[PDB]
Every structure is written in structure tokens, then in C-alpha cells.
Design a protein around this nucleic acid. Sequence first.
DNA 1: CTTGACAAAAGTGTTAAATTGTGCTATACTGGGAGCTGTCACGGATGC
DNA 2: GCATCCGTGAGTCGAGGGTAATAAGCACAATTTAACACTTTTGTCAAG
RNA 3: UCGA
Lengths: 1117, 283, 112, 104, 93, 56, 37, 115
Amino acid sequence: EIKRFGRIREVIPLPPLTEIQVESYKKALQADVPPEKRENVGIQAAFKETFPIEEGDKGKGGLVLDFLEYRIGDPPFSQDECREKDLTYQAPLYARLQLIHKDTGLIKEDEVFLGHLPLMTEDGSFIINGADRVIVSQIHRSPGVYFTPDPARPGRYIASIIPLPKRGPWIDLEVEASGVVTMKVNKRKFPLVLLLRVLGYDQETLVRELSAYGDLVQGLLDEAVLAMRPEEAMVRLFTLLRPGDPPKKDKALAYLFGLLADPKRYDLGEAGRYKAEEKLGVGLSGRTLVRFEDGEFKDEVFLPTLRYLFALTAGVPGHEVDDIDHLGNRRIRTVGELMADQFRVGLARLARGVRERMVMGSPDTLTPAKLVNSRPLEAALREFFSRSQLSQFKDETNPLSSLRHKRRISALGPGGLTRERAGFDVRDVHRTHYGRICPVETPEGANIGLITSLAAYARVDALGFIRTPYRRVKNGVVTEEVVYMTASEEDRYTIAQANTPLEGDRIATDRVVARRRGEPVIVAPEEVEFMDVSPKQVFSLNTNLIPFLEHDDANRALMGSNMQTQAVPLIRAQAPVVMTGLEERVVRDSLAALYAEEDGEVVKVDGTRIAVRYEDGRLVEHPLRRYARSNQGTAFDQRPRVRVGQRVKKGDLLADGPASEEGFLALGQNVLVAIMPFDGYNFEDAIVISEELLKRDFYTSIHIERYEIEARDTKLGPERITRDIPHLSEAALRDLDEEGIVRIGAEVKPGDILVGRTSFKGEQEPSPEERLLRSIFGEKARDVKDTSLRVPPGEGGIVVGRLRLRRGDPGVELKPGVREVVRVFVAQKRKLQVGDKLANRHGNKGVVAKILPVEDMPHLPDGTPVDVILNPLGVPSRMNLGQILETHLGLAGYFLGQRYISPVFDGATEPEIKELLAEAFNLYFGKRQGEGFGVDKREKEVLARAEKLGLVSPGKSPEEQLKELFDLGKVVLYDGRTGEPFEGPIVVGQMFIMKLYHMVEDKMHARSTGPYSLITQQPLGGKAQFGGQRFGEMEVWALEAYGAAHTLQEMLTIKSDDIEGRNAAYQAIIKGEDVPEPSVPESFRVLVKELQALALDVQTLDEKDNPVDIFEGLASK
Amino acid sequence: PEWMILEAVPVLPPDLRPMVQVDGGRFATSDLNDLYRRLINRNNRLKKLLAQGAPEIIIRNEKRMLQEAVDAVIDNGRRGSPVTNPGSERPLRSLTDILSGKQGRFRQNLLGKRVDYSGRSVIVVGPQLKLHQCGLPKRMALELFKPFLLKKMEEKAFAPNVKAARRMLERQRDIKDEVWDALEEVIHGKVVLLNRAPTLHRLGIQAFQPVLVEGQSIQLHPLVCEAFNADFDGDQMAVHVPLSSFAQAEARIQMLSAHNLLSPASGEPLAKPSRDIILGLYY
Amino acid sequence: KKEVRKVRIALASPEKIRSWSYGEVEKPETINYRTLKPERDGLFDERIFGPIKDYECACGKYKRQRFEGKVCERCGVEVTRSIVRRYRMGHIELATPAAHIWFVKDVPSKIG
Amino acid sequence: TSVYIEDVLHEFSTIPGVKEDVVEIILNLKELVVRFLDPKMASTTLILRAEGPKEVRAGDFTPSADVEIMNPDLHIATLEEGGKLYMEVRVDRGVGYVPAERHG
Amino acid sequence: AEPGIDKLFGMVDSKYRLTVVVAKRAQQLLRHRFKNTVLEPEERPKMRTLEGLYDDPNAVTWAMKELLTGRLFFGENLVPEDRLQKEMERLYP
Amino acid sequence: SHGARKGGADTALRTADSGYLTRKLVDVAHEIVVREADCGTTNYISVPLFQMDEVT
Amino acid sequence: GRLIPAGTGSDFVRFTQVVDQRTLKAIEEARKEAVEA
Amino acid sequence: KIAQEPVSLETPIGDEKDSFYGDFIPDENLPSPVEAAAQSLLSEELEKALSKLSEREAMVLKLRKGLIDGREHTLEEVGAYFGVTRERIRQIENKALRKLKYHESRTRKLRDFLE
DNA sequence: CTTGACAAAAGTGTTAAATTGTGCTATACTGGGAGCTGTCACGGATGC
DNA sequence: GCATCCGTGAGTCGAGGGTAATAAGCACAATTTAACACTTTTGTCAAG
RNA sequence: UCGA
Ligand SMILES: [Mg+2]
Ligand SMILES: [Zn+2]
């Protein structure tokens, strides 16, 4: 059965969790959208901005290119096809433009081909270079005007302005304390009355609106300048701000024009114009500062920002300082905004590719056919999707991984902030944050608060203003209005909580929870204005999957969430028997599962393909991808859960997912858990387990790895993938099918070749001993040498994927000078080993310490032993009670088996679970009563000892006492070693855990003697690079602190890069002798010669002041 | 001081400014190369201009470019925006670029470095282990002590000589008792070191008697774990070895864990009972 | 052969620097796009800095250690290990004399 | 211990006409209990055939001497329309519990 | 801990002096294949072995007990390095 | 959550500062090592066990 | 990359020399081989 | 293929600043400790395997295979050494290499180094 | 161990075919070009 | 000497990750390299 | 970017 819980009932479900990536990108798509009627913004803005292109006026050479549509469609290859090809998933985009001569007035229209622009896949993750990647959302303070208290002046106030990043300069209204006012932009200081020159103002209008506020007149007045006129004093600051070029007149009408009036160089987001407009209490249309009207420049922006600034500084109410980190003042860069922006500037590079090319030439043969380029645009957009900070490897570690990852936002990147500049207020959580971004979930490293994750119900409009759903109310009336009230708008009304005294759709108790701006205040049935849909919105995805989360401290909660990201697939995976009930749309919106699109009936199961002929009469099927490799090597599988045939409704799940249990996310398992200090093996957040599960293969998964090799043609001539090797014995040639590659289903130890390759080594005369060695056996010197591709240590198992495409094959392109390439998957079943990372939803980590045999184990009177027995230490220090309550509900619930839905902040409580305990116990004591048993003497003993501290209420019979004890969460356990009970009760039950990504089978590495770096002979690093650890500066220091002189010396010399040191060492130990003393570390010698390149005379002396030769006979010239 | 105006510019050796290819087939190289190159370009072009009696203006300007180029091949960034590989914002790293800085040839290669005969892994509690005891991964230790096992195989029959041992090991995972118990004969006596980053107290690096145990994990005495600033939440500790018998002496004498049991800071005990122990004992 | 207990530092003079060098690097070019052999004067030149191959000359008339240090007459490469490629410097003779930005732009500014 | 099928590459690849994949059919393996009628029989072998749209169970095997199944009702795979599968297994006897990875 | 430590440290003034002692002596033991030493059959630091029980090859432990008796002698500027090292590689192969 | 998250960020950045400190310390007194058993200085500084309680 | 002036390789204690009894008296004699000269 | 130029070693990789390119390149241009001892080994093991050959044919074998001075001496030269015709030196090589072949196929010491 | 005969490996001489380096083009072209931000602390030179 | 600028720093090891794309041309002299012819050396063979 |  499934029983579930909670008081507050969600009035509306969660809008799709995949849209913030898909929809906000889709807005800049305009795919199906007609070529004529379009949105003018997004990708269409990227066109209308860079168009129309023109050089001339009516004159000798004129040219004008004007914009028409960019055919969307024709994807070259489907997702899967692109992924195996290493090609980007993309599609041709077709721009139709007209080339009109200024002179003849002859319109010559031509449609051209821009290039291949990557298109979005289904779940919202693009495929670039054959690899699934993702664009993480970006965040920055929304464009507009702002007002803060003067950082310099004690009581004064300063203003600021700014558009899209780099797409306009900063502006500041600061009053330096002269009593006069100096505006400052891009490192310079000039009077506020300076810029008013061409602004269309003079001595008059200035004092018209100057004194309308207060004492502010004088500082805004000047004499030595103001006598001048717009085109006269125009050259003043132009002479100043740019000494680089000669201060002409005509060039003061140009260089300044592009700064503001140019819509393309000042381009200001539709949101910036918006918010700043309704902010200053004025109106505007153009996204520029001032328009270019017929010579001089008119005014729109400056007058209002002056009005509001001077107002605020005067102290007239309603004009306040706009909050800095406030969500109402900060927008979100989404996929569409980003891609479209990059399209704008990249296509501007292409605009250079247009205006410049059309005059070197003859207007005779002319058409955008020859005038249009690709690489500036195509490679700009190619650059955005890879090298940028906001685009990286998709999180395929699990479905919920990519989900959450796509729902994460970073203030970092190109035009946000950077690591070097961050304060407290930067990564902090603003008062009005609330139901918008997750207050906890964030990397526990130096990125805490740096990368926040999106909340549940919170949305993002095209304006970047985040809007959290609320609920309107008029005097105790619950309205069906779902209010998306803006952050800035949220600060206005009075907002209650979802936990409000809900009864009879009316207000129950007088005093009610509520707030303004984030300030808690008790309210009355009248002043009630808004409410909350559900507390769910106050957190993110993973954070919402934690039951009784109100009992866990924020730290460990955070850890629990990001660890839910760290989760891996499980073959037998079992969804939490106690969850928050959110897992339904978790598997739906993840798009990792297969459902019924409409009403229909199953025909055939066939774990390859499930064919279901729908009620609509048409024959449709939905095949399945079974056991496919992901980015993290985490296995992707979909298990058909429907019989040979039956009829299903629309939305019913016909197939599982990498972790999906009957339409529920299954991370780990709910297996029996005990809590006690067991032989100190669980010491300090350590774990312990039982072999029993290893039999049942509870946590065991499948991991796949990507193997590849290039056939590249050498300067001595080409290589190839073949089955021949000169010296290879028949033994190693086994698994190769017929052509020199490993077949499907063959086990490979981590010595074993997958793909063989053959080359020819450069010709060098064998050393004398080698010459003779070659002579005795007469071994042919086969000019072909083995290039074969082996497998790394620790990675071994069977083989599934085998794909090889040579040069010239259908739908493939290779590198310039390569012949073939081979790619093989290696699949391996990994059972959970000793030392692996495991953790729960409540944020308690650990590693496996010594799995105990099924024999010995703290069983119960039913003889059922436990599976973990986790130590009770990390609980009080790290303060998480959620795992405790979860374990109790699992205690009473294992007997019942029914599920538990405990939504965050609303769910099971002490009385409920108490009744569950009493219930399960009644039926348990029943279980032993009719089966011919009674109270165990050992249990009598434990109850007696517990009765001393009042753990069980005295005077009551041991039956009732065990009822109480069992109710407390703890029962009687018998040591599986001795058979004797334990001095006191031990809380046990069913609790949810997880098998973390980090696996000892991988992380573990060692090297004796490997290769070295080219520059300096210092050994390599990394694992697959086969390299040793480095000894840090602090390591060195500690080593000195011990006072081990030689250990340190050998470390820095013989043991690391020393010239003959390492060699003579290997010699020594190989011969059993003792390693001699080293001479030069050899990184040192490099240092010396570097200093020589700096003409630093490097003189190494000796016991008394004499040149020592550090380089033996080396440079004596 | 006239030397500060130096005429002949020292050129760094080619192998110090490496250029070599890879499996991909393309060639790579350092930045200093390109710097040197463009420099010589300017110098030579200047030389071709001077003798032919070029106008004084172009000459002077070329000398300007000479100074700026040289000084760029030294301190690049000390004057103006540094010269970069054309089209890429990545600045060309000069001499002074490598000599100083975090990852510079100083702090990165002379005050610390990658070392041979090492490796690391996860950590697991040691309740059976003594103060001088560490669980050592099987496979790790095999590919750790490989020279030692080589000589041990030289002494103890099974293969005639040195190379035979190597090739009888690296190929075929055939870890059968010939090895598993010989490495043992070399194991006793000399001990190795364990370190848990960060290295704060010297006790962050201690030494333990190697004991080979089945697994890929690492066992360590629960009490000194505190001194290493390490809990069991999934940490990773690194292991190495004091090759020289002198350095080995050092390792077992003052470097051994069982030896320094007190705080070098507070003079108070170090490994004193922790968590569970205290719990049981007290109760 | 001798303990090094002391490390000095000083200013290298032009003549000294010349003595450090095994030759002037003329053609500012890596190698041939075909042969991958160090260019005639190219920065990677094995003819002055050191042989591309251990104990060998360039053209290959001296392939062996039987000739030690003897300069090849068909090539002009000292027959020796390629090790010297790391320890042997060059120099560039600058037409017009040029200072060094170090003691110039540094805080104390020696020359200034 | 031992399992073979004329149709498969490995422990994974999905057999047509069979709902569960191979390793799931293996989930149904170790959960199968079988006793021999002889104390002296070390190893053995078993043969299985299920064609058509009929399911597969421990009882569907080919009975023989010295073999008895204790759970004929054990579900193996739900075979869809016309699923054809051949199967064979060596069920041996030993002591304790040894994972597949430690024995060949 | 390593058996017989407290006394060892109790001998040399410098905690480090001991290390120098141990190092040099032990290395000398590896030089001659253990025929130098002042340890008799009962004092031979035998190591436990499944195969057969032999003397521990490690020079360090050997050095430990070697000084543990005190039969050795340690001092600075004891004798000129010449005759010191020349007669050591003579007596034993 | 406000308060806590603030705390966490704090501790992190402060770890970085710790690294700063320590390194700098190892670059000054590092050249100091106990050498002369007794230098022979007659100097010394007394350290009273008596600390004044403020405002008390 | 040399011997650190402190620790075991200190310029105080690295001078310490050790001899076993047999070889001790072996050299303790041969020092007197120079009394005839 | 010729088009693309050498890639800078200073190219930062990964998501960080500190992850570089240049120090990720292996140095194979120089011998390795395992290779040093391997070469020294073949040298020594063959050096002792030398004495089991006829005092004349061993010395001769050191020429034809280019051992002594490193430069291979032709049949005519070794013949001009022992005062024997080059044909003699030839059959000397046959019988020497085969006698060694007996000792090899028996001892199985140098059976390694088979690449 | 050696002599003559002879096949192939190797040496050398001379050319054809490729690769590479150089000079020049004439209506008139005559002072670039690209932007960027949300630290922080202290030490020094330098402009008040 | 008083405010205001260039200058130098800022935590440990790791796990991975990665791969890429602008620009004039034509005749001709000067060599370089590939081709070819043929002498000699050297290694093999038949048979003293 | 994520572990510790
Ligand atoms: Mg830890
Ligand atoms: Zn030569």
C-alpha cells in the first residue's frame, strides 16, 4: 500500500522544471513563428540590430543590404547520430536579404547561408562536439538607474546607470565634496553641468527645474563653460577624455554619438528600459540614452535621473535608494538572452565582414551571395557554446543531476563578477529571496552562496525579473488567484505563509504569520493580503526531497542536496519508502522516462521496444535505450514495467529510467539501519555494512568508460588499425574478433589491449648490446612497431559499444592527416567495495568500513539482522534530527510497508508516528504471541536496566514496556557475535541512504617510476597520467619540523627529478645496495639557465669563495 | 652599471623552450619561443634598415619597437597590454613570468614538487591497528615497492634475474603467492609515511609500519586521525616512502607516528582518546 | 668533486653573455615545415646549442661515441649527448644598444 | 553459478521477446533454490526452452535425475508475443557465499 | 612504539644524533652482509616468517638492538675518515 | 538560513587568509634553528602570573 | 636541493661517527702501526 | 595538416586558472630509471655470457656486431685483424652465434628483452 | 678455415623533376581603434 | 607633510577536462630533392 | 567545476 501525509494542500502543481532552459531559449528561436510576424527580440533582435547595413548616401558607391528571414530547419543529424560522430547537434539557418544600389535603385535580392548554429535538444541540453553539454543560467544586476548612499560623502546620495554588459558604459552622479557636483564615467571627473552642453540645455531650463526641489541650485550652476553652446563646448571633454586623437570639431559629433545615441553600442535590455522607466517616474521607448536628432542630441534619460537623484538627496518621500542585491533590481541571463546576445555581437563582426568587403571592389558584380561571410558569425556562436564559462559538461550523474544543474544559476562568468571580487553581500541571501532561489543549496567549497539554485515555483520572465507564486486574500477568503508578484512588487503587500491557520477556507486564529520585505510581523484577519501556495517553493529540487527537513540544520541539509546530485544509478534501486511525495513530476519533468502519450494498449513488451497501439487506431511504438553510457560513465537504462498487453490511460509510465522506481526517483535503498558504536569501526562519521546486501546486490551499479584511438598518418607515412604485431604471442590476440578490435562481451583485465595499431618507428641503429641481442635470436627487425591501445589499471570488465569509422565513411569527417579512428565502450558491474562513499538525504556522510559477515549481526527476536549499524556521534555535532525521525517512521513502517509522504515543513509529526509505532508493535507482539513465544529473558534484562534511568515507565509489565521502548524508536538487539543483548535499547528502523559518486576503485592510484615533465624533469601528476603526488610547501615545512633532513633531501632530489639520482636509485634498490647521494635536483639547473636568460650571473661558490661547476662539462664553450 | 644597457641578449636553450608533437599529430610549444622570434624579427629588420641609410624617423621608431620588444620578452605586462599570441587573449609568458608567481618555477618546482614512488586513496578506521600501523592497499604496495620486490625476487629463487622479475610482474595480474609473500619479506622493518591535506601540524604527516590488507582503501589508527585534521566523511590520504636507509632511519626515529605523541604547540597530549572511546570508557 | 656551500648573484656583462653563447640566432624561425629539422640559424638549432640526437652529429657522418666532442666538418655539430641542448645558450646581437626594463620600472629603479 | 544462452553478447544485451534484460533474469537466478537427490553429485547442468507467448519459471525447466526445484512459481521473465529463448545453467554446490567476480 | 626507544633517546643529547648513528651503522651492516655486528645468535633480530624464520634483513632494526646493548661506540671526530673507512671495507667483503 | 550561510562563507575565506599567514610566517623565522646549547646570554624577561581584571 | 643545515643533517650532529666493537679495536690497533716510522 | 601552427604550452585547461598545458607533456627523449637498469642489465648479462665463447670468436663477434668501439667492423677488417680470410670470420660468426644459441635455449636467463 | 663465383646490399655519378626564393604590378588610394566595469590591504612615488 | 595613484598578494592536495578552423598573385631564378645508372662492398654459396 |  501507499499511505501519504500533510496538512497544507498544494492548490497548484509545479510548472515544468525544464522550461527555464527550453522556453527562455525558445523565445529567441521563433522556429515555427512566421517569417513576417515575429517577436523583434531574441534572435530577431540580433538581425534588426545589425541591419540594415549601408555604406554611402545616394553617392558614387552606395550600398544598402536590408534584412529578411532566416530559414529554420533541416537538422543534419539526430541527437544520437551527432553524439557518436563527435559532431555538434546543429542546423542550417537561412537569411534572406536584399542588396539595393543607392544609385540605380535596382533591387537585387539574394538569400544566403549563414552557417550551422547548434539547436536545443529535448531535455534542454545542447550537443557540442558530440558531447552532451549545458548552458547554466547567469545572473547580474538588472540594467537601469540606481541610487545608493554616497560611499564618499557622509550624508549625500549617489546615482548609477548601466545597460547590458560591455554594451554600455557605467554612469555615476557622485557629488565630490567641493559643494559642486562631479559626474564620473570610465575613470575621469567632470561637472554635472558639463554634459548638459549638447543635451539641449542652457542657463535657463537648468534653473527652471533646479530649485523645484530644495537647496540644490548652485552646484548645478557654472559660468566659464555655460556661456558656451552645445556644439562649441562639445569639444571640451572630447579633448579631455581622449587625448589620443586630435581634438577636432567634426569628430566631436562622431566619437560621442556612438556612446549613447547609437542603439547598437548602448543597447539596453528591454527590462532595463522598463524598470528604470517605471523607477524614475517617467517614460521612454528608445533603448539609448539620448536620440540623434538632426545635428545636436535631444534628451530622454538624464533629466529623470537628475530629477530622482536630486529628489532623494533632498529627502522628498517616495524617492528612495534602490536596493542593491535585491531580486527586483537583479535580472537573469537565460539561454535565449545569451545566445541572442552573442548572435548580436558576432553578427556585428559579420557586419564588418559586409561593409568593408563591399568597398574594395566593383559594384557591377555584387550580391550578398559574394558579400556574406560565415566564420565571424558561425565561429562566434561556436565560441559561446564551448569556451565560455556558462557552458560546460552536462550533469548526467543521474536524471535529477542534469535537472538540478540546469536549474542552477551562477553570478560568475563574462560580465558578472569574478572570484577576485566578492564581498559578504555578494554571496549572501537577500531578505526578499524567499520562494525564488534556494537559501541553502550551494557548493560547500569556496563557492558557498556564489552559485545558488532556483527554487520550485519561482519563474523567470523575459525581463529577468523573478516572480514567486503567492495567493491573494480578501478578509479570510482563499482566492484561486495565483499571484506571481514581482520581487519589487513582493515588497509592497502583506504576505502570509502556507503554514497559516487554514480552516474552512477562512482565517482561524486572530494572530497570523506574515511579513513585508522579509520582516516577520504578526497580523490580523483583516490586513491579510497574500499567502503562500506551499512551503516547497522556499527551496530547490533536491532540498525538497528531504522529509522532516525542518529538523535538520541548514549545513547538513545543503550537503544532503548536493550529495543527491553526487548520486549514481542502481540496478535494484528502491525509491525512499519515506519521501516527500515529489518524485512523480521528478521522473516526469526529468524527461528520463517513457510514458503513454495518449490512451492506448500494449502490444509487445520486448525490452528493446515496447509497441503500444493507441486508442486512436494508429500503430505507434516507443523503443528503449538499454544500458547506455553517460558523461559521468553513469549507466542509463529504462525498464519496461508493463505486461505483454493491457490498456493504459494518458500519462501512465510504460518504462523506467536510470533511477526510476514505478514513477519515483530511486537513489539508494531503505535498508535496515541500526544506531550504536559498533567495535569503534563506525568512528567519527564512518560507516559499516553487512554481506547480506552484497548477496541481494542492494547497492551495486554499472559503470561504462569511453575508449578511443587515432590511426593518424605519420610524417613517415600512415598507420592503421589491424590485428598484426611483430613480437606479440597468440595469447594476447585472443579477444580480438577478426579485425584487430575487442569483440562484444569479452572481459578485459587492466592489462588487456582493446584496439591494436601499427606504426613504423624512426630508424636508429640499435645499441651494441641490442645489436648482438638481435643477432643471437635473429629476430627480424620489423620496421612496423606496436602502437596498440591498452586499458588503464583499475578499469576492467566486459565490452558493449564498439564503433569504428575510417576516413571517408558515410556521414563522417576526420582530422586533417588522420586515417581511421576506433571507439570502444567498456562496461563493468561494480559491486559496492570497502571504503566507498555513501550518504543520506539528511546530510550525513561516510565511507564503508569493513563489511561484516551475514553470520554476526545485531539481530532481533525474529532473527533478522541489521544492514549498517551507524554510529550516533555525527548526529548531535552536525545537528540533523531528520534522519532520526525518518528512521523512526521507517521503524514503524517496515512492519507496515506503506509509503510515507512527508512534504517539507508539512507532514508526519510526533503523535502520528507514535500511533504508527503503537500499531506496528501491537501487530508484532501479536506476531510472536500466536507463533508460540513470549517475553525473552534477555529482553527482560534490557528492560530492567533501562528501568533504572526511567527509560521505560516502571510499574508496568515488560510487554507494555517493550511497547514504550519500541515506540521510542529503539528495540532489543542481540550481538550476532556473542548472542547476548546490549545494555540498553538501540534505535533502529528503515532509513534511506545513497551510494555516492566517488568510488575507491577509481580514486585509488599509485606509481613507482613513471614519465616526467618536458620543461622540468619533475614527475607528472594526475591518475590516468600515471604520476606521483606532489609535496607541498607546507609539506616540506612539516618535514623540516620533524627534522628529517635526508627524507626531505631525497624527496626533493633522488625521489623526484634528480638527474642520475632517480636512475642510480632504481639501480641501487634493484641491486639491493643503498642509494647514493644526489647532486643536482635538475629543476634547479633549469632555474639557473633561466636566470642566465635574464643575464643574471649565477655564481655557485664553495667552502671558500670559488666558482663551482654546476653543469658538468656542459657549457664551457 | 653600463651592463644594464646590455647589447647581446642571452638566448635560452631550445630544450628549455620545448617544441614537440603528440598522438594527435599537431605540434605544441611554449610562449617564450614566439617572443624570442618576433624580437629577432625587429632586431634584424632594424639592421637591414640602418646600413641602407633609411630615414631617421623609421629608424628611431624601429629602435623603440626594439626596446619594447626586448622588455616584453622579459617582464611582459610591465609596460602596456602584454603581447599575446595573435587572436588569443592568453598573454605570452616571459622569463620573469615563470620565475615569479604561484605556479612559477620557484614555488611550484623548487619549494615543492611531484615525486616518484607514491600514491593515495580513501581512508578507513583502524580499531585493530596499533600506533605504528597502517592498512596498505595490495595493488598499491605492489606497484609502489616494485624495485624492492625486484631485488627480493632476485634473492628468493623464482626467476633468474632482474629483468625477468619486471616482465613477470607487469604483464598478467598473476599476483599468485610468489609475490604476495615476498614483498612481505621486504616489508618488515622499514616503514612509510601518510599525509592528509592540508598539512598544518607536522603530525599532518606521520609514519606507520606498512601492513598489507585486502582492499583498495587505507586503514589508520583512529586516534591520530584527529591530528591529521581528518574525519571519515570520505577523505583521501597520500602515501610515500623514505628510500635512503639514512632517510629511513629518520622515518622510524622522529618521523614515526608512535614517537611524537604530544603537541609541539601546547605541550599537551596529541592522540588522546576521541569520541567513541571516551563514550564507552566514561559510560 | 667539490661541495657547493654558497650561491652568489651578479650582473652579467655583454662580453660575458657572449662567452655564455655558442652562437648568434639569426633566422627567427622554428624549423622546416617539411623536415622538422632545426633551421639553419633557427632557435632550435642543433648546430650550436646541441645535437638533436644523443652522441651524434647532424648530417650523420659521425653517428657514434668513437668520436667524442670532435666538431663535424660537413655539419659543424659537436658530437655529444643531446643533454647540452638544455645547458648551452645562444645570444642575439642587438643593432642599437637596449636597456632592461627590470631595474627601470621596479620600485627602487636602479638606473633612475 | 553458471549461465549460458545461445542469444547474448554479455550480461546485458536485451533478448527479443523478453521483458526483463539479462541481468534481471540474473536477479531471478540467485533467488532460485535447487536441491540434488544425490549427496555425491558435485556439478551438473540444466536445459531450458520457452517459445511463444508463454512465461518462464523454474518449473518450466527440463527435469532430470537428481534434481528438484523448490520454487516452480519463481518468476523469471515475462515473455511477450512469440519470444524464443534457449537457456542452460550449471548449478553447483559449495560452502558460504562467493561472488561471481571471485570465481570463473 | 619501537621497542627500546626511551633508553635510546636517553643516550644521545640531541634527538637527531641518534638518527645519524642509526643511519651510518645500519648502512655499514648492509655493506658487509651482517658480518660486522656485535650481536650473537640469541640477539639476532629474527623476523617471523611462514616459510622459515630468518634474520630480519632491514638494517634499521638491526642498528636498533645494536646500540640497545651499547657495545658500539659513537662520537664526533672519532678517527680520521681515511683509516676509518679503509679498514672497514677490508675486514669484510 | 540567512545567518548560517553567512557564517559558512566567512569560515571559508578565512581559511584562505590562514594559508596567507602561515606561509608568511615560514618565510621569516625559518632561518632560526637551535644551535648553540648555551649562547651565554645573561638576559631574560619576567612573566608575572598576575593579570589585572578590567573595571574590577 | 641539498642537505638542510638543521635536523639530522645538522652541522652539529652529522659529524657523529659509529663503530662496532670488533672493527673498533681493529682500527684502534692500526693507529699504532705508525709508531714505527 | 601543415596549416595549423604549434599550440602554446601556456594554454590553461579545465575550468580553473591553475590547470596548465605545458607540464602535462611526458619526457621520453631521455632514459628512464627502469630503462637505465634495463640497458645496464642487458649489457652486464651479455657481458658475462661473453666468456663462454671461444677466446678468438668472442673478440671477433665484438666487431661484426659493433661492440668494441661501437662501430661495426666488416668481414674484411676482422679478417685483417686475425690474419684470416673474411670467409673464416663469417663461419666464425655462424658457429659463435649458434654456440651462444645453445647456451641461451638452455639457460633461459636472457629470454627476456623480447620487446 | 680457404678460393672462386655470384646475388644482393651498397656506393657513387649524373639528371630530371620539385621545391623554394625573388622581383614587381603605375588611376588613385596619404593621422589607428576598441571599448569595461560589483574588492581589498598596504607600500611608494608623486602631485598638492 | 596630505590625499591619490601603480604595484604585489590571496590555501592544500587532488578528480576530471580536453581537442581546432581568414586575408593577392604571377613569372622565374635558385636550389633541393628525387631519379637513375652503374661501380664496389659485402655477405652467401659451392666446395677445397 | 566538485570531493576532502
Ligand atoms: Mg574528512
Ligand atoms: Zn655531421
